[PDB]
Amino acid sequence: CSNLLLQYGSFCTQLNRALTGIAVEQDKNTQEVFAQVKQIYKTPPIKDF
Amino acid sequence: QCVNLTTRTQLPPAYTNSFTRGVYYPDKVFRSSVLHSTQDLFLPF
Numbered sequence: 001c002s003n004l005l006l007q008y009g010s011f012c013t014q015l016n017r018a019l020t021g022i023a024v025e026q027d028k029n030t031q032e033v034f035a036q037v038k039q040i041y042k043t044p045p046i047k048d049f
Numbered sequence: 050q051c052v053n054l055t056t057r058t059q060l061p062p063a064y065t066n067s068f069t070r071g072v073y074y075p076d077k078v079f080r081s082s083v084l085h086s087t088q089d090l091f092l093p094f
Protein backbone atom coordinates (compact mmCIF):
# COMPACT_ATOMS: atom_id res chain seq x y z
CA CYS A 1 0.00 0.00 0.00
CA SER A 2 2.88 2.41 0.65
CA ASN A 3 4.34 1.63 -2.78
CA LEU A 4 0.93 2.37 -4.27
CA LEU A 5 0.74 5.57 -2.19
CA LEU A 6 4.12 6.86 -3.44
CA GLN A 7 2.41 8.58 -6.40
CA TYR A 8 0.44 10.79 -3.93
CA GLY A 9 3.54 12.29 -2.34
CA SER A 10 2.52 15.72 -3.59
CA PHE A 11 -0.80 15.48 -1.74
CA CYS A 12 0.85 14.26 1.45
CA THR A 13 3.57 16.90 1.33
CA GLN A 14 0.82 19.51 0.97
CA LEU A 15 -1.03 18.13 4.00
CA ASN A 16 2.10 18.05 6.16
CA ARG A 17 3.00 21.59 5.07
CA ALA A 18 -0.45 22.85 6.05
CA LEU A 19 -0.31 21.22 9.48
CA THR A 20 3.22 22.51 10.08
CA GLY A 21 2.02 26.00 9.21
CA ILE A 22 -0.82 25.61 11.71
CA ALA A 23 1.59 24.54 14.46
CA VAL A 24 4.01 27.41 13.83
CA GLU A 25 1.01 29.74 13.81
CA GLN A 26 -0.05 28.53 17.26
CA ASP A 27 3.43 29.15 18.67
CA LYS A 28 3.41 32.61 17.06
CA ASN A 29 0.01 33.39 18.59
CA THR A 30 1.14 32.48 22.09
CA GLN A 31 4.36 34.48 21.74
CA GLU A 32 2.65 37.60 20.38
CA VAL A 33 0.02 37.50 23.12
CA PHE A 34 2.20 36.89 26.17
CA ALA A 35 5.72 38.04 25.23
CA GLN A 36 4.78 41.67 24.69
CA VAL A 37 7.63 42.75 27.01
CA LYS A 38 11.01 41.01 27.22
CA GLN A 39 11.94 42.42 30.66
CA ILE A 40 10.96 39.85 33.28
CA TYR A 41 10.03 42.08 36.21
CA LYS A 42 9.60 40.56 39.66
CA THR A 43 7.21 41.89 42.28
CA PRO A 44 8.79 43.77 45.20
CA PRO A 45 9.01 41.67 48.37
CA ILE A 46 6.88 44.12 50.39
CA LYS A 47 3.18 44.62 49.62
CA ASP A 48 2.42 48.32 50.20
CA PHE A 49 0.02 49.34 47.41
CA GLN B 50 37.88 -31.97 -19.21
CA CYS B 51 38.64 -29.38 -16.53
CA VAL B 52 41.36 -28.88 -13.91
CA ASN B 53 40.85 -27.93 -10.26
CA LEU B 54 43.29 -25.47 -8.71
CA THR B 55 45.37 -26.81 -5.81
CA THR B 56 47.58 -23.88 -4.72
CA ARG B 57 45.50 -21.55 -2.52
CA THR B 58 46.32 -19.04 0.21
CA GLN B 59 42.90 -17.98 1.50
CA LEU B 60 41.96 -15.30 4.03
CA PRO B 61 38.62 -14.53 5.68
CA PRO B 62 36.33 -12.51 3.40
CA ALA B 63 37.08 -8.79 3.34
CA TYR B 64 34.53 -5.99 3.56
CA THR B 65 34.38 -2.36 2.52
CA ASN B 66 31.83 0.45 2.45
CA SER B 67 29.75 1.18 -0.64
CA PHE B 68 28.66 4.82 -0.52
CA THR B 69 26.21 6.45 -2.97
CA ARG B 70 26.85 3.69 -5.55
CA GLY B 71 24.54 1.43 -7.51
CA VAL B 72 21.93 3.88 -8.82
CA TYR B 73 20.43 3.09 -12.23
CA TYR B 74 17.77 4.49 -14.52
CA PRO B 75 14.43 2.81 -13.67
CA ASP B 76 12.77 3.54 -17.04
CA LYS B 77 13.44 4.37 -20.69
CA VAL B 78 11.88 7.84 -20.41
CA PHE B 79 13.65 11.19 -20.75
CA ARG B 80 13.17 13.59 -17.82
CA SER B 81 15.03 16.90 -17.51
CA SER B 82 15.41 19.09 -14.41
CA VAL B 83 13.11 16.95 -12.25
CA LEU B 84 13.30 15.54 -8.71
CA HIS B 85 11.78 12.08 -9.23
CA SER B 86 11.02 9.54 -6.49
CA THR B 87 11.06 5.78 -7.01
CA GLN B 88 11.04 2.49 -5.14
CA ASP B 89 12.80 -0.61 -6.42
CA LEU B 90 15.63 -3.03 -5.70
CA PHE B 91 18.58 -0.79 -4.85
CA LEU B 92 21.91 -1.14 -3.12
CA PRO B 93 21.59 0.70 0.23
CA PHE B 94 24.10 3.50 0.66
Ligand SMILES: *[C@@H]1O[C@H](CO)[C@@H](O)[C@H](O)[C@H]1NC(C)=O
Nearest residue numbers: 050051052053054055056057
Ligand atom coordinates in the same frame (compact mmCIF):
# COMPACT_ATOMS: atom_id res chain seq x y z
C1 LIG C 1 38.80 -31.18 -8.20
O1 LIG C 1 39.46 -32.47 -8.67
C2 LIG C 1 38.52 -33.46 -9.20
C3 LIG C 1 38.44 -33.32 -10.70
O2 LIG C 1 39.74 -33.19 -11.21
C4 LIG C 1 37.13 -33.32 -8.57
O3 LIG C 1 36.51 -34.61 -8.54
C5 LIG C 1 37.21 -32.79 -7.16
O4 LIG C 1 35.88 -32.77 -6.60
C6 LIG C 1 37.77 -31.42 -7.12
N1 LIG C 1 38.42 -31.18 -5.78
C7 LIG C 1 37.73 -30.40 -4.73
C8 LIG C 1 38.41 -30.17 -3.39
O5 LIG C 1 36.65 -29.95 -4.93
